[PDB]
Amino acid sequence: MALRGFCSADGSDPLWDWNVTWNTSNPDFTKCFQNTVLVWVPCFYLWACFPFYFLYLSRHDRGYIQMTPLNKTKTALGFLLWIVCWADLFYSFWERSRGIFLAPVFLVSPTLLGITMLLATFLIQLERRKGVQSSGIMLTFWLVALVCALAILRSKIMTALKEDAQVDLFRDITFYVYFSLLLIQLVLSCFSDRSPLFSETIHDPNPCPESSASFLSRITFWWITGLIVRGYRQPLEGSDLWSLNKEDTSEQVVPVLVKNWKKECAKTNPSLFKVLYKTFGPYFLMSFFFKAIHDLMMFSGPQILKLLIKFVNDTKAPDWQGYFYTVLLFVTACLQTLVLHQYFHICFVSGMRIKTAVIGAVYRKALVITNSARKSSTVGEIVNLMSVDAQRFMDLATYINMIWSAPLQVILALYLLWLNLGPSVLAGVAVMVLMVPVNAVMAMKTKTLSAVGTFTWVCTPFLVALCTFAVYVTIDENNILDAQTAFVSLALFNILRFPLNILPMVISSIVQASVSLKRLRIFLSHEELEPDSIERRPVKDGGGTNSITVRNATFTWARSDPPTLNGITFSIPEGALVAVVGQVGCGKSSLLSALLAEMDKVEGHVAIKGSVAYVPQQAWIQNDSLRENILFGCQLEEPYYRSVIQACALLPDLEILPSGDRTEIGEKGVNLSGGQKQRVSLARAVYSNADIYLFDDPLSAVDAHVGKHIFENVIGPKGMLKNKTRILVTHSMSYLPQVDVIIVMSGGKISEMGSYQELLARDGAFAEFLRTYASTFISFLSIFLFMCNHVSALASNYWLSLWTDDPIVNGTQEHTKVRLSVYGALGISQGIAVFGYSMAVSIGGPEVIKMFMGSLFNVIGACIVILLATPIAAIIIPPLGLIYFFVQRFYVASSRQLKRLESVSRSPVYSHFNETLLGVSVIRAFEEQERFIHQSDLKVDENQKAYYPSIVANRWLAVRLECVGNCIVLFAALFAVISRHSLSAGLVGLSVSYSLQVTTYLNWLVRMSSEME
Amino acid sequence: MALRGFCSADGSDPLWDWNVTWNTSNPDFTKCFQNTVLVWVPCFYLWACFPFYFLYLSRHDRGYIQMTPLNKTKTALGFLLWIVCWADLFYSFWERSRGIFLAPVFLVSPTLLGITMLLATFLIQLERRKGVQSSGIMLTFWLVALVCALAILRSKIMTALKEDAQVDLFRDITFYVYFSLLLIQLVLSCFSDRSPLFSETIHDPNPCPESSASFLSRITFWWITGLIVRGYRQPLEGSDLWSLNKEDTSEQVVPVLVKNWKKECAKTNPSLFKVLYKTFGPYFLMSFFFKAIHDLMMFSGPQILKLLIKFVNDTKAPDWQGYFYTVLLFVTACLQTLVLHQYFHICFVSGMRIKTAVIGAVYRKALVITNSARKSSTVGEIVNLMSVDAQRFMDLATYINMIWSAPLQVILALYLLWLNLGPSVLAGVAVMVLMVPVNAVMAMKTKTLSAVGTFTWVCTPFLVALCTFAVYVTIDENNILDAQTAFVSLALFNILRFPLNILPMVISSIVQASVSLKRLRIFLSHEELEPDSIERRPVKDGGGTNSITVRNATFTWARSDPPTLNGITFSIPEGALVAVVGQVGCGKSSLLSALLAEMDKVEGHVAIKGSVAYVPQQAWIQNDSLRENILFGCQLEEPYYRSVIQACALLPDLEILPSGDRTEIGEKGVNLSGGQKQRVSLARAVYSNADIYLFDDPLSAVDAHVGKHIFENVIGPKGMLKNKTRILVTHSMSYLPQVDVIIVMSGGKISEMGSYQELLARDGAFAEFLRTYASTFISFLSIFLFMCNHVSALASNYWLSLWTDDPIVNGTQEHTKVRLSVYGALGISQGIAVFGYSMAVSIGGPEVIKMFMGSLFNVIGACIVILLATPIAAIIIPPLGLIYFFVQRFYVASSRQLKRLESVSRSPVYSHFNETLLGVSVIRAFEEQERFIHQSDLKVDENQKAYYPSIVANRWLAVRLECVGNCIVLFAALFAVISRHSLSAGLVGLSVSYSLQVTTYLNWLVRMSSEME
């Protein structure tokens, strides 16, 4: 209560009077209020946002924009804005000192403005130093200060020329100068800044323009209009799209997630969503504050409307009041559409940023890890995990914020409806519960009346309103239907309807996401890094005499099975032909694979020296050129290519092919034979030019006569690779005598080792093997029904408006029985007509034309109602009938060509992953597993360059189609307040109510039932 | 008088009447006036501009802009606008047919609007067909129609909502739709068109943007701001300039003038003047119609000011009148500055287009015509005709339109002043004749206190005003100095002053131009075509046996002299060495030159064969590379270059040079000896590789040994040119015996011809010749004086304002004879102060700082006066104190770098013309005179590319610095009309008078006293 004594020494200027600002014909604020609150509010606004902005900006150094003249003039203006406010205080000090008592108010309030201006000037310099072009804080502060100064300027201009007023000629000049400088700075603080000294774009010439735009352009999504119009004439395809900004690329996201997951695993299990909470968490806290505010802006629509009606029925209030509400019907309807469409963008971006990391984390955990423990099917169990489970992590991101906002709106709307009407709404909302069976009906239709059901859905607002009003009127008495009662609930029900629709289908989505999480987690922890290290590396030393060393080796396929190899110990020098002999199923494959770090060793010491080349019995070919398949990464070399082709004898195979060594080999191409595949693999192996070669019956399917030249050309001692180490396994008989050393193993143990001559002289197991084997009319009806239904609805609304304005005498209002009778009769007629045209269209037939005609006729009716209420609105119909039109044609011809590129670019990632998963066994032997990781990175990135601008073109139109909807309410309220002396309450209520339901029906027509056709 | 019965049957709605539009508190037009005149005016405006536009556009086909959607929508909008106006007439016909008498007025107007709408729609398509992007007629028509319809809309909105009247609901909707469509079309018809299918710019990538700009941009000169801003930071030089538009080039103007002049000469200073008038007449006639509107709008300021001053003194007129005049103070002050600056551009372009044609005509006449009759000096008589006479043909273009507008303004202003004041102004204007002496004074100050002279010039308006008012108030006593009398004449004198000063220096310029015309015509009429046809061409036939044929030849140097050659007849075969022998002054040079078609023949037959090479005794070198000088256009050839260098023996000369054959030879370079020059010319001649060679003592200054070596190297029979025809003349005593045929001539007649042996055996005159030639402290004082003078002027103005508002009692102005005394005393004090600071600045010394300080103090006073008159104007001072500033700094730093390129580019054309005039003889001997015309063309075009945008940057600032001046009058009248209840007439008069004189003093500061220092 100190303000009363603070304002003056007599208490004659109370803060609020209610007799000077509201009840007069010329409102004007008092003195103390103007001096204190209007001055203080900007300072409090800015002083509570400086530490947060400073802390946020202390981590985002980006540039050094040096000496633009804008920074030279803005600093000067900010410094000049301080000296006048200081001079005011200096003059006040003089006046106090000499002879005048002036109260402490003049000695305190001015001194804060100087401090705030000094802080703003310093912030401009810091903002320039940290290098950001457009500012989102200076604009708002300048706007607020300008409005607060405009109020005082109007008050002073009104009180100046009243009657011979005595005003000191030292506070007018100061305030006028201050206001002019504020206006100049507001204009000047929105142009641009030149550029940072250095930027990321040094080589790529096509960057996205989002990094360089003004605050208003980013708010209104204007920078996307560049490539939309260009898509209308010139077809859109190829490199016309932009490039990423080096932040969403897969090379800068996956390592962070994999490191955090590895650290969490080493800490110990909680699911990976626990890690995602601490990785991608601080970007969802901005998507929670934006939603709630929007919700509180939804219920400022009806209330104002109610007030307006109460103003029309009063015939003695001052006129200007009717202009105070209308302005508030424009700001509130404007700030609501500039907040939701930013929360949507944040949610979509943070939901897209997760899939590009999960995909990479899955891929990097398959090619080099989880060996010998993979038992799930190769198709539909691993590849499906890349296309279905990871694709259900964007819906959850958008829908996770609808779990608590769904019941809040319902509770608030029910409370307001109960406050307005009374207990009857409990029955009325019961009808709302009674049409929960209607959503049950559409659900069971989806399981399996569709048109009949949707027309009952269309008609159900009428049914619920009629039932509510009948219950309100029939029960009890002495209740009169005013304009507010019958014209507020109609909007409240429409607002409340949507959350009762959104509640289903969400609880199923959450369950499905939770189910998918279990599978993702069980796969990401499906191993314990089996091939960590058991060998002496494929190549560790560049020089040695003994190639393969092994002592006391023992390996097993699985940890729960008896060992298959025991007591394995041998040594082999360099450049010796070693051939092993074993029976079918003896275990040759297991021993052969144990050398490639594909087994589990319990005890033993084994080592190899030099890079290895592997030729498995099964061959795989990547879908590419035969030249590329043979080269396998290495560049061409002549006549090395000719030499290796001659050695492999590929001349007939190259000649028979339609284009030689350039056709489509493998899948999605011509089919070959097994022998040709084996020859191609052998050619690739010999081209690899390794130190040790490891074969596995590479000539079984090749004809023996044909394979004779191959054996005598390369494998035999006459070949060009006689200086390397060769290992060959087979069950052939002919090639045994020409090898150097023969090793025979059975029962998991090696029996004898030695040369062919020594084994033959011994006449032991080899002799026994040789001896045993011994192989050495409806259109016009539909139109008429449409017209009947629409005129029935219009007559219903007109009759309700006429009824709501009946005079009140002796409690009741004349007659309240015939109105209900005619209302019910017309409702029954409309219900008959809707089913009649339902049957007509069902017999004639579809839904696209249905909704198209419905929306067109409804918007025509919405226009004609406003035309009938006031004959001056016809000025604004033409100009608003064109701006919308040009929006509905650019979007259809530009969002239909960007929805086809994704279907083209989707397949390659899945195909590449399937190929890698099928060829991992051979890909790991060559020690070439980084190139493939890089390769599968450049295809996912190509599916996120043509997909990012396919959703912004959805946040464009939606914004552009809501300003049109909100520019009719203002002009239907302003043109109705001017002529309050001749308009009843009902007509104003109808005109205002029909202007709210235009944006929904305008947006429905453009998206659905237009692009489909 | 038919309108009275046309409006209505009983004539109850007459035409204009002051009882309903002017004397009321709510002005509103009547019914018949609204129905007829406002509607009819647009139709008459457009219907009187269609044939002219059609005729002008039927000759300027430029493109085929095909199917822009703007042309698709504008036609539809026009066709829609037609139908509503037709429907109005249809409904009127129905109403007249059924039961209603409605008068013929409703049956005429719609059928007259429909025709205009259809014509506009057709004109859009016709405009599209001929390919013009921006239209200057559609915008004006739409604006006029909208302005006319605004009043009808206001009346129909005012008469409907209030008074509870009855309005038919069939004419409101039609008019509202019509107004909305008009607004939409006005907005839509000012964007752009796409492009013509083909344009001139196919190769050059830097065209001037003037060919592609909107109407508003062309009017406001907003396409030169692109490079003015760019030149501030990056230095301006080189290729940053644009290119011509293929219309001002010298290859497309000179032929037209030369053809017209030749035709006029063949028909037979009236001749040249008539030819110029017939050639460039059409584009100058547009300059007469633009210096008529501005002259009339000049006199619309004093009338409005007088009306406003009279209105302020009235305290019962309705308030809104004060807002009708102020708007008229903005349109009139705006249309005046958008007309003069469009006449200046046309005048300057027409002035520039003449010099580029006169220069080309003179050059094409000089080189190949007027031979043997040139007697004027080579310097200062012909070259001066290219730089002085043709440079005085741009001032005449601008000043020729000031010969009749100078006295018209004087006469009109004198008549108005006499009407306002009376006979006293005749005495006062006599005192205004009294500065005819003082301008004569500065005239003699130009011939030989000058600061004192200009300070008396500054004080002159005060002196003449004081004398006029003293004379007005002294004689008799019948008139009282009101506000209008003392505040209209002050502006009228200032308006009238300038033409009284422009009149001198023009009559001298006209005389000088008339003098220059005589010399230009006497040189251009100097044709006297010498080389018409006298020879058989230098080369006509490619095959023959006799080289030179001559019979009965006779030639003379001049037509008024006895012939020097008579009885010349001889013949020589192909490849014969012919040497002629003559005495000194015998006439060898005359006969030698006669063979080159440099003489005139009265009788005889002479003929030559094959292209000729000429080596005159005097050699000329163009300032270029020695390689280019020797090549003379031909490309280099090896080892031809080495062969000719060895033949000419140029090895020591090339070796001794600092860079060999690459130095700067000739003028502006190193000097060379005469022998080297002769050797260079001989090398050029032999490089020419002609059929007939003609020498003239080419070894006079050459050393005897060097000359002998050259003679045996090339000229002698052992040389490489023995197969062609050689002619040599000399007086040497050694080379005669080795020649084939010797010809001796004397007295103009050839005596004997024959071989050396025959002549020696004859022992005639040859033996005689042989034997004959064988025998042989103030700064602060200046500041104080400045302040005293300015406060004295301010006190003078304030005292006059106080005096003019004295009450009138008994016919007299209270008591006079006391204001005049103090007025004169303060005037004398101001004169003493200005003389004192004159002496101070003369002793201390300059003019730049003088005018700078004067303008700064005057412009600060012009703002302090407005601030004192009304304390609310302080809002507008800051924002207008910045827009001007940024204009003053860009222009100074961008028009100082474009005023230096001309000084660089001026010299080459004069230097090239001098070189050509000195080399004419050799340049014509070689039959190479077409390349040099192009060479001299390519430079005058380079002097007109950096000069065209050096004057538009003067029409930019002047436009940008007059809207600031005209935006203070509006805000000083509006802020003074609001508070008429507390302001006397004197303060309003002072404020409005001082607000006019701000543009002149703002423009004076930027151009002078700023750029100079």
Residues of A in contact with B978 (CB under 8 A): 161
**Residues of chain A contacting B176 with CB distance shorter than 8 Å:** 872, 874-875
Domain-located, residue B369: no
The torsion of the CA quartet B597, B598, B604, B607, rounded to 10 degrees, works out to: -20
Please judge whether B181 and A878 are an interchain contact, meaning their C-beta atoms are less than 8 angstroms apart: yes
Q: Is residue B932 part of a domain?
A: no
Shortest Cα distance, chain A CAs vs residue B875, angstroms: 5
A845 in a structural domain: no
Cβ proximity of A782 and A837 under 8 Å: yes
As given in the structure block, the two tokens for residue A378 are 């190769």
In angstroms, rounded to a whole number, what is the distance separating the alpha carbons of residues B844 and B782? 10
- Burial grade of A828 (CB within 10 A; 0-12, 13-18, 19 or more): exposed
User: For residue B33, which of B141, B151, B140 has the smallest C-alpha distance?
Assistant: B151
**Are B626 and B483 within one domain?**
no
Please give the Cα distance from B726 to B577 (Å, whole number): 6
Q: How far apart are CA A672 and CA A685, in angstroms?
A: 19
Q: How far is A183 from chain B (nearest CA, A)?
A: 9
Do residues B497 and B537 both lie within one domain? no
Distance CA A928, CA A632 (A): 10
* 3-class state of residue A576 by DSSP: coil
Residues B668 and B574 in one domain: no
d(C-alpha B277, C-alpha B263), whole Å: 15
Q: Which residue has the tokens 């239909």?
A: A896
Distance CA A889, CA A232 (A): 9
Q: Among B656, B684, B712, give the residue marking a domain's end.
A: B684
Q: A172–B871: do the CB atoms touch at under 8 Å?
A: yes
Q: Is B747 annotated as a binding residue?
A: no
How many other CB atoms are there within 10 angstroms of residue A249's CB atom?
17
Phi and psi at residue A664, to the nearest 5°:
-90, 100
Look at residues A731, A751, A773 and tell me which one is the last residue of a structural domain: A773
- CA B943/CA B941 separation, integer angstroms: 5
Position A539 in a domain: no
Provide CB contacts within 8 A for B336, sequence distance 6+: B294, B297, B298
- Joined together, the tokens standing for residue A996 give 């709210």
Nearest CB among A180, A876, A979 relative to B878 is that of A180
User: Cα torsion at A382, A383, A385, A388 (round to 10°)?
Assistant: -150
Q: Is there a single domain that holds both residue B733 and residue B664?
A: no
Cβ within 8 Å, pair A875-B176: yes
Residue A132 · residue A68 · CB < 8 Å = no
Q: Write out chain A residues lying below 8 Å of B864, CB-based.
A: none
How many angstroms separate the CA of residue B982 from the nearest CA in chain A? 9
Overall size of chain A counted in residues: 1013
**Tokens representing residue B106 in the block:** 């409703």
Helix (H) or strand (E) holding B642: helix B640-648
* B624 bridge partner residues: B665
End-to-end CA, chain A: 69
Q: Which of A160, A184, A877 sits opposite B878 (nearest CB)?
A: A184
Is-contact A627 A662, C-beta < 8 A?
yes
Scored b (16 or more CB within 10 A) or e, A105-122 reads bbeebbebbbebbeebbe
Asked if residue B151 and residue B53 are part of one domain, the reply reads yes
Q: Which residues contact A809 (CB under 8 A, 6 or more apart)?
A: none
Contact residues on chain A for B183, CB-CB shorter than 8 A: 879
- What does residue A728 show for φ and ψ, rounded to 5 degrees? -130, 135
A174 → chain B, closest CA residue: B874
Are B128 and B157 in a shared domain?
A: yes
- Please give the helix or strand (H or E) that residue A546 lies within, else none: strand A546-553
Long-range contacts of the stretch B22-26 (C-beta < 8 A, 24+): B24/B318, B25/B318, B25/B320
The runs of H, that is alpha helices, within A100-170 are 109-130, 138-160
Assigned token pair, B837: 């600071």
Work out the minimum CA distance from B392 to partner chain A, whole angstroms.
Answer: 44
Contact list in A for residue B882 (CB cut-off 8 A) is 184
CB pairs under 8 A between A and B: 56
Q: Do A872 and B979 touch (CB under 8 A)?
A: no
Cross-strand bridge partners of residue A725: A692
Please tell me which of the candidates B169, B181, B982 has its beta carbon nearest to residue A871: B169
One domain for residues B583 and B700: yes
A164: alpha, beta or left, given left = phi > 0 and alpha = psi -120 to 50? left
Whether residues B71 and B183 share a domain: the answer is yes
DSSP letters, A432-497, are HHHTHHHHHHHHHHHH--HHHHHHHHHHHHHHHHHHHHHHHHHSSSS----HHHHHHHHHHHHHHH
- Yes or no: say if B840 and B782 are a contact pair by the CB < 8 Å rule: yes
B180 with A979: Cβ contact below 8 A: no
C-alpha span between A206 and A210 (Å, rounded):
12
Decide if A832 is inside a domain. Answer: no
- B979–A184: do the CB atoms touch at under 8 Å? no
Annotated binding site of A for ATP: 557, 582-589, 617
Contact B294, B405 (CB under 8 A): no
* CB–CB contact B871 A157 (8 Å): no
Q: From the centroid of its chain, how far is CA A398?
A: 8
Query: Which of B:161-220 have CB within 8 Å of A?
Result: 161, 164, 169, 172-173, 176-177, 179-181, 183-184
Q: Which residues contact B536 (CB under 8 A, 6 or more apart)?
A: B606, B607, B608, B609
Three-state DSSP state, B205: coil
The residue from A755, A773, A791 where one domain ends is A773
**Nearest residue, CB atoms, B161 vs list A177, A878, A979:** A979
- Backbone interruptions in chain B following residues (C to N > 2.5 Å): 268, 448, 776, 845
> Are B564 and B508 contained in the same domain?
no
Choose from B74, B162, B875, B886 for mutation: most chain A CBs within 10 A: B875
* DSSP code string of A719-769: STTTTSEEEEE---STTSTT-SEEEEEETTEEEEEEEHHHHHHHTSHHHHH
Q: Is B582 annotated as a binding residue?
A: yes
B618 is known to lie in a ligand binding site: no
Q: How far off is chain A from B977, nearest CA to CA, in Å?
A: 12
The whole domain housing B744 covers: 533-611+690-776
Stretch (H or E) spanning B221:
none
Return phi, psi of residue A914, to 5°. Answer: -60, -45
CB contact under 8 A, A161 and B874: no
**φ/ψ (deg, to 5) at B611:** -65, 145
Inspect the interface and report whether the beta carbons of B875 and A176 lie closer than 8 Å.
yes
Resolution limit, Å? 3.8
Q: Residue B574 half-sphere exposure, CB side, CA atoms within 13 Å?
A: 10
State whether A173 and B879 contact (CB < 8 Å): no
In which residue are the tokens 């200009």 written?
B454
Q: Greatest CA span in chain B, whole angstroms?
A: 140
- Are B864 and B790 in contact by the 8 Å Cβ rule? The answer is no
In a domain, A997, yes or no: no
CA distance B874 to chain A (A): 6
Number of domain units in chain A: 2
Contact B878 A978 (CB under 8 A): no
Residue B949 contacts residue B897 (beta carbons within 8 Å): no
Q: What's the burial of A384, exposed, middle or buried (CB within 10 Å: 0-12/13-18/19+)? A: middle
Contact B875 A179 (CB under 8 A): yes
Closest residue on chain B to A175 (Cα): B875
Q: How far is CA A565 from CA A533, A583, A589, B214, in A?
A: 19, 15, 11, 91
Instruction: Give A980→chain B minimum CA distance, Å.
Output: 10
Whether A204 maps to a domain, the answer reads: no
Q: Which residues of B touch A876 (CB under 8 A)?
A: 180
Write out residues 867-896 of A within 8 Å (CB-CB) of B: 871-872, 874-879, 882
Angle between helices A272-279 and A506-524 (to 10 degrees): 100
What technique determined this structure? Answer: cryo-EM
Give me the count of residues in chain B: 1013
Chain B residues with CB-CB distance to A160 below 8 A:
872
Name the residue of chain B whose CA is nearest to A187's CA.
B879
Are B495 and B579 part of one and the same domain? no
**What dihedral angle (degrees, nearest 10) is formed by the CA atoms of A457, A462, A464, A467?**
-140
Nearest to A176 among B176, B183, B874 (CB): B874
| Residue in B177, B183, B871 closest to A874 by CB | B177
B978 in contact with A, Cβ within 8 Å: yes
Helices (H), A234-339: 254-267, 272-279, 286-296, 300-312, 321-335
DSSP of B761-791, one letter per residue? HHTSHHHHHHHHHHH---HHHHHHHHHHHHH
Nearest CA in chain A to B981: A161
User: Which helix (H) or strand (E) covers residue B883, if one does?
Assistant: helix B877-892
Both B695 and B680 in one domain: the answer is no
Strand, helix or coil at B720?
A: coil
CA distance B393 to B532: 32
Residues of chain A found within 8 Å of residue B177, distances taken between Cβ atoms: 874, 878
**Domain presence at residue B288:** no
Q: Are residues B759 and B725 in the same domain?
A: yes
CATH number reported for the structural domain that contains residue A672 in this entry? 3.40.50.300
